[PDB]
Amino acid sequence: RSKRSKLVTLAQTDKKGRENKERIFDEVREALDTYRYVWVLHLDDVRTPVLQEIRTSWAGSKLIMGKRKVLQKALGEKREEEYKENLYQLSKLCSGVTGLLFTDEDVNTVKEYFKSYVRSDYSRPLTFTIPEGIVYSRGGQIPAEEDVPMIHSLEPTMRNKFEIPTKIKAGKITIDSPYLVCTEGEKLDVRQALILKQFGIAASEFKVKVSAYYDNDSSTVESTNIN
Amino acid sequence: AHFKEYQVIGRRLPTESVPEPKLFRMRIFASNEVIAKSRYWYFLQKLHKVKKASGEIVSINQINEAHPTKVKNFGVWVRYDSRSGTHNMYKEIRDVSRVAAVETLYQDMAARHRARFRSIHILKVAEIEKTADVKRQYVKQFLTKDLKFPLPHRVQKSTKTFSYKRPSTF
Amino acid sequence: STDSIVKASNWRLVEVGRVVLIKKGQSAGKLAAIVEIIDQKKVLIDGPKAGVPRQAINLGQVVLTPLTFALPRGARTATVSKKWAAAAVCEKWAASSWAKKIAQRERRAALTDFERFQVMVLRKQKRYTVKKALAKA
Amino acid sequence: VEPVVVIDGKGHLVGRLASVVAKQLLNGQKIVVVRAEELNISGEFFRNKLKYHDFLRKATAFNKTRGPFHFRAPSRIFYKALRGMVSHKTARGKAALERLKVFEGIPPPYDKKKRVVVPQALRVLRLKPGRKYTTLGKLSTSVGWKYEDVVAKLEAKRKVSSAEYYAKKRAFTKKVASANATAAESDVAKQLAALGY
Amino acid sequence: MKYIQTEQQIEVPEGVTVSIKSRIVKVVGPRGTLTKNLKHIDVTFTKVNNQLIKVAVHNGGRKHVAALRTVKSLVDNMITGVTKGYKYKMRYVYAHFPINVNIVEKDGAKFIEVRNFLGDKKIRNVPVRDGVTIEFSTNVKDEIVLSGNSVEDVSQNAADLQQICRVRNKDIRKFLDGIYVSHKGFIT
RNA sequence: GGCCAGCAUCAGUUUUGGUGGCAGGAUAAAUCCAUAGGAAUGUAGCUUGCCUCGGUAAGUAUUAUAGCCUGUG
RNA sequence: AGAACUGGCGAUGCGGGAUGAACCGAACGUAGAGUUAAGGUGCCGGAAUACACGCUCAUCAGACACCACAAAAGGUGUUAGUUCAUCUAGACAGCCGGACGGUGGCCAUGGAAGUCGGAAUCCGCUAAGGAGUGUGUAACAACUCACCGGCCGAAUGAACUA
RNA sequence: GCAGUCAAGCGUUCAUAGCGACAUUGCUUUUUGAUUCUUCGAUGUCGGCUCUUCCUAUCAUACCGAAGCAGAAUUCGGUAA
RNA sequence: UUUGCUCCACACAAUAUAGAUGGAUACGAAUAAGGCGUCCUUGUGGCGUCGCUGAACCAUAGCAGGCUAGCAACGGUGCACUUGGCGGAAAGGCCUUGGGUGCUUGCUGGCGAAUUGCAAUGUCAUUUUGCGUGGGGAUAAAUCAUUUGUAUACGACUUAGA
């Protein structure tokens, strides 16, 4: 005995299994002879309306995402086994979180789009000092006369997880010394990014980068480097 | 005791209009000749309708080991009776010969499950030929290559009552 | 001066090719080689040069020696006897000081009483040359 | 074979030592047990204490004087376990407890003599490792034996006076064994090796 | 199930040196020296090469192997105590009465003296263990910092100091007074 | 020829050793010798890899510069 | 308390159950040697601190039929089994990332936006994302898991049986 | 207590030959704190003055734990004779 | 109260043995570790070795151990003195200096044993005391009676008296 007691729940959603893997094994091999362009895209951090923007903007494209080794299983990782030919070099490149794209419009439009397409997400850049008074949920962005004081439930979250010293006088939250969370030109810590997350500061821009292209009729591997 | 492996064959009764009953052999583990004949009628009654008085024994043979000094892995199927109802059991023993393995099975059942000699039935004893299908874990850990282990803290068994040495271990 | 002085704690360890001495049993004082380990307590030994038959044995009946030689696991009796003389452990055993201890109490037990009188007179003569050599330095 | 066997008491189990002593007394061997405060019991410390308090509350209800006598010293606690193993009410059991002396520490004249041990009573040979044991000296202080501070002080007096002896005996066996080596290779010693000495 | 041998590994960095006779462990490096006695645990240490040392238990049960992971965990804390060292910072939040905390030296013993806790007249002395140096935080209101080489000297001396200020026979949802440990961090 | 004893060769009962001759079984099974086929906890060779200049890692290779298993005689 | 067959004690010693009319051996003339029964072999106490494989740690262990007697079910103690699953093509553990749109779904109301509540509970896009398990703001925000994905590289989980 | 209901288990293999823990429903003198003034055959002898001791299943005092525990008071609960 | 009293030396008598018949032969600590030797930069170092039983080490020849002749050695051992220490846990022992003094089986010679009749423990150690010898040593108290009252049922206790 003396085993770990696992937490049992009652939620609605259930686990997928292997049968969702083998469908993505089939949908990748089906999309090769159907569409003409194979675009592999490295995109590590994503936001869901960013992804739901790219899906609905392009009807001719099919943006198929999944596990990496399933994509190696379906495209064929070794040169000996592959669905269509000259395909084992481009599947070597997908090392990060990658989702394949199957369009048929142009090779110039796709490579032009993602440099033109840019968004803004969390920083995960500019520095921020907190005033030594009542802290607000915007955090000195907008004028504090219109601001909202922070909810005191996340104040124990601030004293323990964010390491920021907050002692509380009355219904609002107070700090007594001015505190800066980041400095410019520095790689941000994960505790520094979560301060900017609770403050709602997504002031670092986001863009998706693409790494390679394949054409079925030409049957050759094309590598393009844009960030 | 020291177990021996025997072969007992049966020949129900040569009667009129049924001459030559077919034959019925078994492999019995026992400590001598007399128990193995009585253990043969114990199993053979359960299968079909004979008795000892309406039966007879053809022959007995001691089955010696085919390869004594070759170390074998064994997988033994055992059915036993608990204090509650009966249920099966599959255990695996690494040992030298066939009949020395069931020697250590009766020591193992009576120690771990408190099963006496009368409550244990031997289904089939077979040798595992190829490795890497040995299902148990306490058997596989002797199958890693170049196995070396020390024996720390050896005790000493002396003859006299007083030793003048303040005796040491290893 | 910037090293780790961690001790090693040297142990005789069972393995394939460890030569052993049989302290009790039928053979009782004959060298043999561990061929294959069976489990924690039982091993498969053989020494054909001394005369012990190839057999399983329990580790409580055997005592481990420091000497070793190389041998493939699961070797047969003819293959052991070739690798035995190739390491010449019959010569290497008597060179050890422990095998001289066994031969000494074996020789002391077989002494004729007239020879035991000769041990008497000779140990008188040796103690006289010592006690003059002592108490000068 | 010796007239008096002097048993060192450090590292032994209470029961297994008392068994092998209570047989040698009835067969006639004189025995003195020294350093009985360093003796050991199997079982952890908090058990043996509760196996002393249930002994400690047994007393003759109408007069506490006449009851079971609860000795507290470690020399006497071992003497309890030994007196239970000898038939002490007869005349043979009383003449076998005249053959026994038990002490804390090592008093004179027993420090100058050879001390022996009993291998089948040793703790390190008997209990499996990873198993709790209990020093009898620590038990007796926790039940009222107010002399631990004196015995441990008189050992540090003895251990210094013992080690100054041992440094002379060690240097004396250095001078003998080297003078034995020059007696080796002489033909009076070449014959002894043939005879086995 | 009588495991034949298990092992763990101790990662020795470049600064420190470790001297292990039978079960006596000494860790010497940049910040200082430490010792820890291990005669009870019955294991075997083996050096391979100057940065890695393998612990070992041969032929042990389940209890004897579970006590082999913790010997790795003790020597690794003896390593980070000498390379980096430990530093516990404590905040002592009061409701109404200003808590006066001082360091006093009676007879060369260097106690920690707490006064005026929840208006009490009682003086509490918390003794300071060997090798833990208490300093009061500069320019941060209401903070006391404990720091030393050993985990078990520092973490015990911070745990002692908050049990000495436990509020008795009152409701802890209302009365906020006490001393608490902010977070358990390193020096460097 | 009264009392208690010691040894010798025997008889009755009985305990405890040493050692010798034969019959059985699969005319013990094994080892051992021969000879076919085989396999990995894969030996030599080979190939790659990092690399203190040979050492391990992973690939090939069925006895060679170790051997083993199975079957038959 | 009252019946049936047999064996007992009553009339009955001896050896074993510490002690006992009924249980276990066994039935008695007086002595010697030898071998045993039931029961035993650490010491009292005559006899192996015998050999072998395991299991067990109790802050009231347990130790022998009749016999001096305890019952269910619980236990993140430990050991051995049973069928079902998941996996070296990446499982299980844990950090990290996403965890969405129609939507602040109908009514309820001083306010209820996934969560004071009744009835409900359907589709879109998805690798995956419930008209939504928990933290709680007067509502909201905010965090969490359930669901998938990134790293690391060997097995692991559930249900029971004794 | 009887009479149901629900069903993890049990019953040579077993749902439905038949048992049934854990729950729960049946009223047992009136849903608005009005009262019920109901003692219903103890067929049998111990009780009390003095005095000692022993259990724990703790009424007080020691120390903890948990609750709308603001204090004040007061409850539940544990170790302890 | 008849010359008692004590310690040392010796002779006879007694008196018993819980059981002499080569010798109780001195480190401490750890046991998943130590012992001894050797070096060294003195250390929780380096190297070498030993254990697996005290079956050891020491001692041991002579009429139960005799009377003598030598050789070789400066050693061994016993007894009485002496010199300087050390030990208080119940030390009551352990070393040590100077001579004296026997013995020597380290080596080699000569003499002696018988008759205890073929075995009978074939007596060989050690407790306690007594009676006389011969050299020293030293010259008391308690109780009852009488009397106190801090005491007291009687004993006891507490005080006094040349």
Curated annotation (Swiss-Prot), chain B:
Keywords: Cytoplasm, Isopeptide bond, Phosphoprotein, Ribonucleoprotein, Ribosomal protein, Ubl conjugation. One of its GO terms (cellular component) is cytosolic large ribosomal subunit. One of its GO terms (molecular function) is structural constituent of ribosome. The modification Phosphoserine is found at S31. GO terms for biological process: cytoplasmic translation. Its main location: cytoplasm. Transmembrane segments: none annotated. InterPro entries: Ribosomal_eL20, Ribosomal_eL20_dom, Ribosomal_eL20_eukaryotes. It is found in: Cytoplasm. There is a cross-link at K124, K130, K148 (Glycyl lysine isopeptide (Lys-Gly) (interchain with G-Cter in ubiquitin)). Component of the large ribosomal subunit (LSU). Mature yeast ribosomes consist of a small (40S) and a large (60S) subunit. The 40S small subunit contains 1 molecule of ribosomal RNA (18S rRNA) and 33 different proteins (encoded by 57 genes). The large 60S subunit contains 3 rRNA molecules (25S, 5.8S and 5S rRNA) and 46 different proteins (encoded by 81 genes). eL20 forms multiple interactions with RNA and proteins in the central protuberance, connecting components of core functional centers that are located far apart. HAMAP family: Ribosomal_eL20. Present with 54300 molecules/cell in log phase SD medium. There are 2 genes for eL20 in yeast. PANTHER family: 60S RIBOSOMAL PROTEIN L18A (PTHR10052). Belongs to the eukaryotic ribosomal protein eL20 family. This is Large ribosomal subunit protein eL20A. It comes from Saccharomyces cerevisiae (strain ATCC 204508 / S288c) (Baker's yeast).
UniProtKB/Swiss-Prot annotation, chain C:
Gene3D superfamilies: 2.30.30.30, 6.10.250.2270. Belongs to the eukaryotic ribosomal protein eL14 family. The keyword Cell division does not apply. GO terms for cellular component: cytosol; cytosolic large ribosomal subunit; nucleolus. Disulfide bonds: none annotated. Pfam families: KOW, Ribosomal_L14e. The modification N-acetylserine is found at S1. Present with 45300 molecules/cell in log phase SD medium. N-terminally acetylated by acetyltransferase NatA. GO terms for molecular function: RNA binding; structural constituent of ribosome. This is Large ribosomal subunit protein eL14A. Component of the large ribosomal subunit (LSU). Mature yeast ribosomes consist of a small (40S) and a large (60S) subunit. The 40S small subunit contains 1 molecule of ribosomal RNA (18S rRNA) and 33 different proteins (encoded by 57 genes). The large 60S subunit contains 3 rRNA molecules (25S, 5.8S and 5S rRNA) and 46 different proteins (encoded by 81 genes). Keywords: Acetylation, Cytoplasm, Ribonucleoprotein, Ribosomal protein. GO terms for biological process: cytoplasmic translation; macroautophagy; maturation of LSU-rRNA; ribosomal large subunit assembly; ribosomal large subunit biogenesis. It comes from Saccharomyces cerevisiae (strain ATCC 204508 / S288c). Signal peptide: none annotated. It comes from the Eukaryota. Transmembrane segments: none annotated. It is found in: Cytoplasm.
Curated annotation (Swiss-Prot), chain D:
Coiled coil: none annotated. There is a cross-link at K175 (Glycyl lysine isopeptide (Lys-Gly) (interchain with G-Cter in ubiquitin)). One of its GO terms (cellular component) is ribosome. N-terminally acetylated by acetyltransferase NatA. GO terms for biological process: cytoplasmic translation; maturation of LSU-rRNA; negative regulation of translation. Keywords: Acetylation, Cytoplasm, Isopeptide bond, Ribonucleoprotein, Ribosomal protein, Ubl conjugation. It comes from the Eukaryota. It is found in: Cytoplasm. Disulfide bonds: none annotated. Gene3D superfamilies: 1.20.5.4280, Ribosomal protein L13. GO terms for molecular function: mRNA binding; RNA binding; structural constituent of ribosome. Belongs to the universal ribosomal protein uL13 family. Component of the ribosome, a large ribonucleoprotein complex responsible for the synthesis of proteins in the cell. The small ribosomal subunit (SSU) binds messenger RNAs (mRNAs) and translates the encoded message by selecting cognate aminoacyl-transfer RNA (tRNA) molecules. The large subunit (LSU) contains the ribosomal catalytic site termed the peptidyl transferase center (PTC), which catalyzes the formation of peptide bonds, thereby polymerizing the amino acids delivered by tRNAs into a polypeptide chain. PANTHER family: LARGE RIBOSOMAL SUBUNIT PROTEIN UL13, RIBOSOMAL PROTEIN L13. Present with 43300 molecules/cell in log phase SD medium. There are 2 genes for uL13 in yeast. This is Large ribosomal subunit protein uL13A. It comes from Saccharomyces cerevisiae (strain ATCC 204508 / S288c) (Baker's yeast). The lineage of its organism: Eukaryota, Fungi, Dikarya, Ascomycota, Saccharomycotina.
Curated annotation (Swiss-Prot), chain E:
It is found in: Cytoplasm. GO terms for biological process: cytoplasmic translation. GO terms for cellular component: cytosol; cytosolic large ribosomal subunit. Its main location: cytoplasm. Component of the ribosome, a large ribonucleoprotein complex responsible for the synthesis of proteins in the cell. The small ribosomal subunit (SSU) binds messenger RNAs (mRNAs) and translates the encoded message by selecting cognate aminoacyl-transfer RNA (tRNA) molecules. The large subunit (LSU) contains the ribosomal catalytic site termed the peptidyl transferase center (PTC), which catalyzes the formation of peptide bonds, thereby polymerizing the amino acids delivered by tRNAs into a polypeptide chain. Present with 52400 molecules/cell in log phase SD medium. Belongs to the universal ribosomal protein uL6 family. This is Large ribosomal subunit protein uL6A. It comes from Saccharomyces cerevisiae (strain ATCC 204508 / S288c). The gene is RPL9A.
